[PDB]
Symmetry: C5
Subunit: 312 residues, 5 copies
């Protein structure tokens, strides 16, 4: 029909609330996730008021095509939501209760500066456009905001799901808008990365470092170059999960430092052999004896400094 | 139309049953499977009752748009089911029979603690929301629960398909709900993993262990490091099927233990060569003679202990 | 409208036939293929009969919404077919001709026991459910079963497309059903597997076997271990096409036998070097001279026995 | 309505034409491409004729649901086209002009005998089925066949887009059909394959051939076996683009010849070392001196013969 | 209804404007991106004019099915846009305001000559077809062209979004068209390619170059051939992102030059060993001493020349 007339030019208030039923398919590369939830609306149309004692009923049921329903839209979705109407009810005073169940695909940026040990906030924006004869604003009904106890995200820990009460009001396309923000806080589960990636890589590194207790040039070359090939295959497996970012990240810095260490170890081996050939064995012995202690300490200090820089 | 009036404020009972026709596309990473089944409903509307001897017919056929049909929904599906109506029939006493065929995509968590030798239970939840003038509850009709003899899941053995008779009743969004649980028990087929993964890996391990019967440092390095590269490529192939979990699993523990063994073998080779160079051949001979027996026994004991810890 | 009345309680017969237009997207992992075909129906409604000489026309054309059309369904499809109606015509005696063009996705198990040289049969099932006032049965019209001369499946040779004349009658959900089976026989094209997989692998095997004409331990280790790495990469490429089965297959047995051969060759090399070091050169010479002949003959006999076991 | 009546039992002619707007997503494995084009129809209905000077208009506009429009279908598409109607106009004499814009997915076989330097023809078939009271035939209107100047296929050069004027008439399902063929000729862009695949492979081959200027058995084994591993990784990368064919192809023959060359080079190395050990150095020197020239000449002659066999 | 009548045979002008809300899924291989935006239209229908003081309202609201709306289409989209109507309003003078929100998939070529450091322009074309009784032309309304502050493309920097004011007028299918061009300028974020690809490759190159400070033929072969295997795996990882082009590109030229360098280094090693064996040590010493300086300088000069050729 037509939007409800004002009595003294007041804004119409619409009370919202979202109840989460499902959450799945969080994609890091595309920065998307799928949702399945309820949507609840409530407003007041004085034209719908009835007498209870006369009609003999306290509650009225309507079809969606018989009354005026405001148009509420999601802002950061790919296509329009797929929704069906659950129930419409009207109170004797005039207030109408609206409920529907929908599904949608949401777009939301992510931060990867602490990739294996990070936390993300996901947003859902709701907007409504005013009409030429009425002003509409949004409100939050805290009795209708929640989630199911069975909601699970594969690889994440859900912490909270709250709304910002204050809406943002502005002008878009020569018309006034009102916007609402729903937030969902999550935490990555990082247990499996330790014995899957971290410890095997340290094992390969320590296996490469055994070249400082040997004096055979050929076995030293084999050791180092083959451990480097294995490092490359590990890096290639790891880089498939992380997308490209315009800022430096923890894992990338670690990987670059590992390459740098392999380079310096090759240089040390080559210098040792060169000095040996040139009949200067004492100098090569002292250099390898120094390197034996120097490499792990500098590795440990580099790692401590990096962890303080990124997480402190 | 309108929900059937109560006679003395009693709850309306709706008898359900699901007959499985197809089951396919079980995805471990996304924890989803597709289904194709029948759905059967039965209730009583006294307003539909007729006389058999008068009309001259015992059974009445209606369209779906001519009578009141309760709204039944699936809880853990991605989008609403695609369904068509097969037949609607009404009995002379008032009972109506409903049948439809649907397709849907279901979400269900999985446990991977015994990944190659595990068993899964899959759930399907059915819910119905009460109306403002009547209370609706769900019941199970055991004469209409079953599956086809041609249902096949690629890589799984189907065991049973039963329902829990007792429904769960609660309040959601200031309205009463009733929920039903259907369970499907399956078992992985694990025959192919043995000669495909398990035995070749043991072959590579035993091939790496031949370095305790040799005294050549270069061939020992080649042997061990190349077998380690092959182990890495096997692990990389295997890790594509298992998703990330927040708990320890059998396969991951085995793989970590294999890396640990390779590390210790490199250390043994290096110690042997170092003692040989230093003119202490008896000590190196005794160490390699000890290691020859020590490695397989400790492997076997570790494996027995792990298998008792995970399956016992 | 309503199903055609019986004259003396006889079953209504419906004559079917499928004409294939397209066949594509045969997926081995998912055991599915896509189809595009005609569907032809024919039955008799005495209520439609007219006089030819009166109306002045011999053939009558109807819309699909103006007459009763039986409901025919496909049993092993994922979702309901997408179909449109081509023509409906009625004969003066009462017989009606029905034609439509559809598309669907079909599910059908496959056998992989002779994977590179196998043959498959694909099934399509058609079912019809009886109504409360009439019994319906299915028949096959052999004048309307065929395929186009341009039907092509990428990698397969189509042999025949026939129907089983006798239908299967049973009771489902307290109602009678009738089912029909359409079969399509195909054969894999195996020419490309020979110079793509088989011969290169034999080349690598023969290249590994050159270690019995050498007495250098390091080159022998390099030869064998590197050929084994190449075998692993070939196996990893091959295993992507075959899905997991619960029975043994020809290719898997060949691959396991190849691993076993590599293991035994490593053992032979190690024994040879060990005996040489221990100052027993005659025994090592005799062992390598024996192995030179022993390996290819045992390979050939194993292969003959396996081929007789699987194909004989 | 109803198909236009004949005057003296003549066939109705329908003039067609396709104007290409877009062409994208050419898939070699699945032998499919997507299209976006116009479709133009023209015929004569004497029942639509009007007087221009009376009505005061020269052109009449109708809705698609108000007149009879022939049913035109595409033969080698996966699903029915998605189309919308652009304009319908009628001439005072009776001729009607029809225009629509559609999108579709087309199936078309490809030939790969000259894979990097091949040319393909793509077909689009149009069919129409006669009715029980009229015969319909197809014609080509050369003033309405063309393509846009912005049509681009990623990796192909478009040459021409023409139609065969003569239609093919036959009987299908006891009814007459008429079929039309549209052809689109393309050519692969082969510039990038040279410095991406061809030249690096020749570099690896020439690097393997340096073993004829050396007398060290271990470095010769390392050289050859490692170059063979690199050849295998190149072949594995290349084989992902080409599908399986039942005939021999140029690239596959080249790859098989490369494997054969590696085999023969390993044999040469082994024979050389064997003769050296046996105290026959002159014979090994002469054999390696012969091989130095023999290998590249036989490679070049083999390549010339293959190129003449496939392209001549 | 019917298009608005001209007063003195003038063209109808339609004022357009696009406001960007979302931009995502830029695919390099397929040259596509997804968009979500507003669309604004404005024209004048004298038949809609009313009196404000009489009706007592200044603004009129219509349904989309009650008035004539011009047909506007996108030219380089895959399928027709998914759109819904937001508001329709009419001014007392006769001007009508139109707004809608749509989603579409756009096709647009890309240039890769400076792949890691390139900039792209993306186009969106709008067309309208004239009718048989009126001429329609397009105009640009600069007060309705813009984008949101939250628009983000994963891996790109958005610079501007403007329109070309002058439309292109021509004749298509014997009817006049008008076309408009919207442009969107972007820039790749290239920070992550440096420590991810560029520097590790230089490390491997410098590690291969250590063979000019050694006189052991076997370690030199191991060094060079293994670094070449690592280069091949890096190239294989990199080539998955770039599609095939018919012109030369910066990255491909760099990669080819790296292969050429590896070839020449193998040749140098082989010549050195050959001269050493032949008892000419001074000549081999001088050659390796020359190569030590010659290789990096020629690399640096080649790189400078290439960078000037492609970016200067
Ligand atoms: C030789 C063997 C070398 C093994 C050295 C192991 C050194 C590191 C082990 C411990 C690292 C963790 C530090 C403390 C972390 C902590 O407080 O726990 C929090 C955190 C919770 O993980 P979330 O994803 O948030 O929850 C999912 C699981 N509950 O728990 C962990 O980090 C657990 C880490 C256990 C890994 C132990 C390594 C496995 C193999 C050990 C081999 C020993 C022989
Ligand atoms: C040198 C060769 C070394 C070969 C050593 C083999 C050692 C292990 C072989 C047997 C392991 C199985 C123990 C018993 C298992 C059992 O009771 O059977 C149950 C189970 C059923 O599998 P499901 O997936 O549930 O059903 C699908 C197939 N029916 O069957 C098996 O596990 C069968 C295992 C057979 C594998 C034999 C290995 C193949 C090659 C052997 C080479 C011999 C030369
Ligand atoms: C810090 C994190 C790890 C750092 C990287 C370590 C790489 C691997 C190191 C290998 C050590 C090899 C030492 C070796 O070969 O020496 C044998 C050495 C020589 O001793 P003597 O002959 O009595 O000394 C005479 C002069 N006083 O004898 C031994 O057996 C020493 C003990 C070796 C076993 C324990 C070594 C543990 C190595 C790494 C553990 C980290 C986890
Ligand atoms: C040194 C070179 C070593 C080369 C040794 C080759 C030994 C095997 C070659 C022949 C194997 C086939 C046996 C007979 C098979 C037969 O009767 O043909 C049937 C069958 C039909 O294939 P379908 O997929 O059903 O149809 C598609 C193609 N028409 O044809 C074949 O199997 C053809 C096999 C030819 C392969 C020849 C190998 C290619 C390279 C040879 C190199 C010679 C130098
Ligand atoms: C437990 C599971 C497997 C454990 C890992 C095994 C790795 C491979 C082991 C290789 C054994 C090599 C032994 C070797 O080289 O010795 C040759 C040895 C020396 O004997 P004599 O000179 O007479 O002894 C003089 C002093 N009494 O002679 C032989 O031929 C022995 C027999 C060797 C063949 C059988 C070996 C089987 C090896 C593993 C089988 C597991 C499956
Ligand atoms: C040491 C360096 C060794 C380099 C040796 C190079 C030997 C081959 C180079 C030339 C091969 C081409 C023969 C003539 C081909 C011809 O006539 O051109 C047609 C054809 C057109 O390609 P289309 O896909 O149809 O169109 C897209 C591009 N216009 O052009 C080509 O084939 C161009 C080939 C150029 C490749 C040059 C190799 C690149 C690097 C050279 C390194 C030199 C130092
Ligand atoms: C069966 C299928 C293949 C089996 C696996 C074969 C692996 C490769 C075998 C390599 C053979 C190497 C032989 C070798 O080095 O010997 C050189 C040998 C020594 O002869 P004399 O010094 O005169 O003998 C003195 C004592 N009567 O001289 C030769 O040149 C022999 C001929 C070698 C070339 C032909 C070899 C063919 C090898 C495999 C072909 C299979 C395809
Ligand atoms: C031993 C270690 C060797 C390290 C040598 C490093 C040599 C190159 C480092 C600097 C290269 C960049 C030149 C100047 C570029 C410039 O002006 O900046 C623009 C540009 C902006 O990137 P956009 O994608 O447009 O924006 C996203 C990030 N803001 O910034 C860069 O290029 C930054 C480059 C920093 C890379 C530093 C390398 C990382 C590790 C260094 C190890 C040192 C120890
Ligand atoms: C045909 C296509 C390529 C074929 C495959 C080539 C593989 C690589 C070949 C390597 C050649 C190595 C030659 C070598 O080591 O010899 C050094 C040789 C010995 O000469 P003298 O001692 O004076 O001779 C005394 C007796 N008259 O001295 C040299 O420096 C010769 C020149 C070597 C550099 C040029 C070689 C080019 C090699 C391949 C180019 C193809 C592109
Ligand atoms: Cl929405
Ligand atoms: Cl549902
Ligand atoms: Cl169906
Ligand atoms: Cl079509
Ligand atoms: Cl459009």
């Amino acid at each position: 029909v037509s939007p409800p007339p004002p009595i003294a030019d007041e804004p119409l208030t619409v009370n919202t609330g979202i109840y989460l039923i499902e959450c799945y398919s969080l994609d890091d590369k595309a920065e998307t996730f799928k949702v399945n939830a309820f949507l609840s609306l409530s407003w007041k149309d004085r034209r719908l008021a009835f007498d209870p004692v006369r009609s003999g009923v306290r509650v009225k049921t309507y079809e969606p095509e018989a009354i005026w329903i405001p148009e509420i839209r999601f802002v950061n979705v790919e296509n329009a939501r797929d929704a069906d109407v659950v129930d419409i009810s009207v109170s004797p005073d005039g207030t109408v209760q609206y409920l529907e169940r929908f599904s949608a695909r949401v777009l939301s940026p992510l931060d990867f500066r602490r990739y294996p040990f990070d936390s993300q906030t996901l947003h859902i924006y709701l907007i409504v456009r005013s009409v030429d004869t009425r002003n509409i604003v949004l409100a939050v009904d805290l009795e209708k905001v929640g989630k199911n106890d069975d909601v699970f995200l594969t690889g994440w820990d859900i912490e909270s799901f709250t709304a910002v009460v204050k809406p943002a009001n502005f002008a878009l396309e020569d018309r006034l808008e009102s916007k609402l923000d729903y937030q969902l806080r999550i935490s990555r589960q990082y247990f499996s990365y330790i014995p899957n990636i971290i410890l095997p890589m340290l094992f390969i590194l320590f296996i490469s470092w055994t070249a400082f207790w040997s004096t055979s040039y050929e076995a030293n070359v084999t050791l180092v170059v083959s451990t480097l090939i294995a490092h490359i295959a590990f890096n290639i497996l790891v880089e498939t999960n992380l997308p490209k970012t315009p800022y430096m990240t923890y894992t990338g810095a670690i990987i670059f430092m590992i390459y740098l260490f392999y380079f310096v170890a090759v240089i040390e081996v080559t210098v040792q052999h060169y000095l040996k050939v040139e009949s200067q064995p004492a100098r090569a012995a002292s250099i390898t004896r120094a390197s034996r202690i120097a490499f792990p300490v500098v590795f440990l200090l580099a790692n401590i400094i990096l962890a303080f820089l990124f997480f402190g």
